[PDB]
C-alpha cells in the first residue's frame, strides 16, 4: 500500500512519514529510493548519527531530512523537485543490520504549468 | 516581488520564508491573507506570544506556523489545501506596533489530477 | 495478473491519421509512466513515447516528434497514441508498455502484445556483435555501448520470434522478478554486458539494451542469438 506525494517542478516537496515512536524507540531513520521491484533502494539520506540529535536536520544535496522521535514523525525535503525524483521510495527504520519499511512513498512531479518570464 | 508557492488540492502545502536571523532578532512573526492591493492583509496566525519559544507550533484552523529564529526561516503550513485557499499572502516581523514584511506569498492550488480509485 | 491490450491498428493511407488504444488492468494505472514502442517488420525495437500519470510531461522520440500525441485516461485505465502525417516508415507493431514506478533512472516492466499499423504504398545505443551464434549450454556475453555516460542506468529486453519484448536486466544489474538467474548484467558509464551464464533452448532470440538516463529512452539495434 503506497502513498503518494505530489509536487510541482521547481518547488520544495515535504514527505511526512509517521510512525509509532514507541516501537521505534531509539532507531534512527532513512530515505532511500527503490529502482525496482527487486532493488535497489539505494540510500539517500539518514538521521544523525547519535539518535539523542535527530530532530537535526541532515542533507545530501537536495534531500534533507529531519526526525520527530517525540510524536513519531519523520520528514523528508526533496528540495528543487526535479523531473528525475519522480519514482518509489522507502521510509527505514534502522536497528543494527535490520531495515523496517515504514511507509512506501510514491513520488509524482507535476510539470510547472506557470510562466515566470518578467 | 512575489513568491509563487505551488500545491495540489487535498496535500498539505510548506511555505517558507527565509529572513535575516539578525535583523529580526527578538521579533515574533506572523501570517497574514492580502485581500487587494490596498488590504487588509488579515490576520491569520503568528508565532508564540514568547519569542524564546518560536520552534513551538501554533495553529489557527488548518493554518500552523513555526519558527527558526537561529537559522532564519519561517514555516507556514496549510493543512488540506483547497481552492479557496488561492490568493496572496504576507511573511511579516513584528516589532511594537509594526509589521516588516518578510515575503509576499502567492499561494496557488493545482486540482488533484490522480485518480485514486485503486 | 497485469495486463495490457492494445487495439486501434490496421491500414492507413500516406498522410492519414489513426489513434492506438492500449487498455490496462492489474495495477493502479494512475500511479505508473507508460510509454510506446514501435518493432518495424525485419528490424529493431524504437522507442516512440512516455507520458507521466497527470500528463504534464511527455516525451517524443524524434522521428515522431510533432506528428504524435501520447494521453490516457486515468479513470478508464486506457493509454492512447494518436498519430498524424503518417508516412511509409510508421509501418510497424506497435507496443504498450508500463514503466516501474518514474521514469528517469527506471524501465519498462510490461508490455502489451502489440497491434499492427500498415501504412500503404540525443544519446546513441550500439550493440556488439549484431548476430551471434552460440550452443546450448554456452556461456553468452552481449555488449552495448552508450554514446556518453549513463551511469547504472541500462535495461536488457528479450525478444524471442513472434513474440513480445520481455524485461530482463534493469538498472545495469538487477535481476527482474521472474527471470532465471542465468541471466545478468554489468557495467556503468558507456561500457555494459549482458551474459547468460549457461545457454537454454529458449534463450534464442533477440536481445536489446536501453538507456534510460535521459528523457528519450533509446534502445540498440539488436542482437540476435542464434543456433549454432
Known amino acids: 500500500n503506497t502513498t503518494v506525494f505530489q509536487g510541482v517542478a521547481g518547488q520544495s516537496l515535504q514527505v511526512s512519514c509517521p510512525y509509532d515512536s514507541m516501537k521505534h524507540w531509539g532507531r534512527r531513520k532513512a530515505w532511500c529510493r527503490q529502482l525496482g521491484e527487486k532493488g535497489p533502494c539505494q540510500r539517500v539520506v539518514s538521521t544523525h548519527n547519535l539518535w539523542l540529535l535527530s530532530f537535526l536536520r541532515r542533507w545530501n544535496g537536495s534531500t534533507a531530512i529531519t526526525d520527530d522521535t517525540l510524536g513519531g514523525t519523520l520528514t523528508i525535503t526533496l528540495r528543487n523537485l526535479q523531473p528525475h525524483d519522480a519514482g518509489l521510495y522507502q521510509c527505514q527504520s534502522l536497528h543494527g543490520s535490520e531495515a523496517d519499511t515504514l511507509r512506501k512513498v510514491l513520488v509524482e512531479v507535476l510539470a510547472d504549468p506557470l510562466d515566470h518570464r518578467d | 516581488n512575489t513568491t509563487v508557492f505551488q500545491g495540489v488540492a487535498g496535500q498539505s502545502l510548506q511555505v517558507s520564508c527565509p529572513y535575516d536571523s539578525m535583523k529580526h532578532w527578538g521579533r515574533r512573526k506572523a501570517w497574514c491573507r492580502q485581500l487587494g492591493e490596498k488590504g487588509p492583509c488579515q490576520r491569520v496566525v503568528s508565532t508564540h506570544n514568547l519569542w524564546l519559544l518560536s520552534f513551538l507550533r501554533r495553529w489557527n484552523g488548518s493554518t500552523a506556523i513555526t519558527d527558526d529564529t537561529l537559522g532564519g526561516t519561517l514555516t507556514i503550513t496549510l493543512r488540506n489545501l483547497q481552492p479557496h485557499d488561492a490568493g496572496l499572502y504576507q511573511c511579516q516581523s513584528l516589532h511594537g506596533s509594526e509589521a516588516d514584511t518578510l515575503r509576499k506569498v502567492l499561494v496557488e492550488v493545482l486540482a488533484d489530477p490522480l485518480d485514486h480509485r485503486d | 495478473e497485469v495486463q495490457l491490450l492494445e487495439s486501434g491498428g490496421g491500414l492507413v493511407q500516406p498522410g492519414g491519421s489513426l489513434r492506438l488504444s492500449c487498455a490496462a488492468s492489474?495495477?493502479?494505472?494512475?500511479?505508473?509512466?507508460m510509454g510506446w514502442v514501435r518493432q518495424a517488420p525485419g528490424k529493431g525495437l524504437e522507442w516512440v513515447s512516455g507520458?507521466?500519470?497527470?500528463?504534464?510531461?511527455?516525451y517524443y522520440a524524434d522521428s515522431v516528434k510533432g506528428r504524435f500525441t501520447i494521453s490516457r485516461d486515468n479513470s478508464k485505465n486506457t493509454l492512447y497514441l494518436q498519430m498524424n502525417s503518417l508516412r511509409a516508415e510508421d509501418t510497424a507493431v506497435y507496443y504498450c508498455?508500463?514503466?516501474?514506478?518514474?521514469?528517469?533512472?527506471?524501465?519498462?516492466?510490461?508490455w502489451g502484445q502489440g497491434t499492427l499499423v500498415t501504412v500503404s504504398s540525443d544519446i546513441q545505443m550500439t550493440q556488439s556483435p549484431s548476430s551471434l551464434s552460440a550452443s546450448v549450454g554456452d556461456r553468452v556475453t552481449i555488449t552495448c555501448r552508450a554514446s556518453q555516460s549513463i551511469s547504472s542506468y541500462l535495461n536488457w529486453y528479450q525478444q524471442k520470434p513472434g513474440k513480445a519484448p520481455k524485461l530482463l536486466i534493469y538498472?545495469?544489474?538487477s535481476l527482474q522478478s521472474g527471470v532465471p538467474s542465468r541471466f545478468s548484467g554489468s557495467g556503468s558509464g558507456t561500457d555494459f554486458t549482458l551474459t547468460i551464464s549457461s545457454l537454454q533452448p529458449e534463450d534464442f532470440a533477440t536481445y536489446y539494451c536501453?538507456?534510460?538516463?535521459?528523457?528519450?529512452?533509446?534502445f540498440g539495434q539488436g542482437t540476435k542469438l542464434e543456433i549454432k
Open positions: 507520458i507521466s500519470p497527470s500528463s504534464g510531461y511527455t
Open positions: 536501453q538507456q534510460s538516463r535521459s528523457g528519450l529512452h533509446t
Open positions: 508498455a508500463r514503466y516501474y514506478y518514474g521514469y528517469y533512472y527506471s524501465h519498462m516492466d510490461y
Open positions: 492489474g495495477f493502479t494505472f494512475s500511479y505508473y509512466y
Open positions: 538498472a545495469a544489474s
